[PDB]
Nucleic acid binder design. Structure first.
Ligand SMILES: [Zn+2]
Ligand SMILES: [Zn+2]
Ligand SMILES: [Zn+2]
Length: 87
DNA sequence: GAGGTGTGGC
DNA sequence: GCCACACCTC
């Protein structure tokens, strides 16, 4: 039940929220509103969370620490898969 | 691990 | 719109 349809070149992809469609439309337009501000870096991204992932390459930030060993991860889904190895 | 992206509470 | 969740593919 998706009411927000993409009307670009007969794409037809449909989403549940308008903000989802607006983000998808960037695949057709090449718009990248989220700019890395790291010194000397000119990378830009269509989604804010893609920029977050990029910043963690600059900072080495790994917020998701495994509570059963010393390993840490930049993303929760990486940790979740690793945790299965403990059980 | 990384890239891409569909989803939904707020 | 922000943000992280969740899943697929490589
Ligand atoms: Zn489209
Ligand atoms: Zn950067
Ligand atoms: Zn572990």
């Amino acid at each position: 039940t998706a009411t927000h349809t993409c009307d670009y070149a007969g794409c037809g992809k449909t989403y549940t929220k308008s903000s989802h469609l607006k983000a998808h439309l960037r695949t057709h337009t090449g718009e990248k509103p989220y700019h890395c501000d790291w010194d000397g870096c000119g990378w830009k991204f269509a989604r804010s969370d893609e920029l977050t992932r990029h910043y963690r390459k600059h900072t080495g930030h790994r917020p998701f620490q495994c509570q059963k060993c010393d390993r840490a991860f930049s993303r929760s889904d990486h940790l979740a898969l690793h945790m299965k190895r403990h059980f």
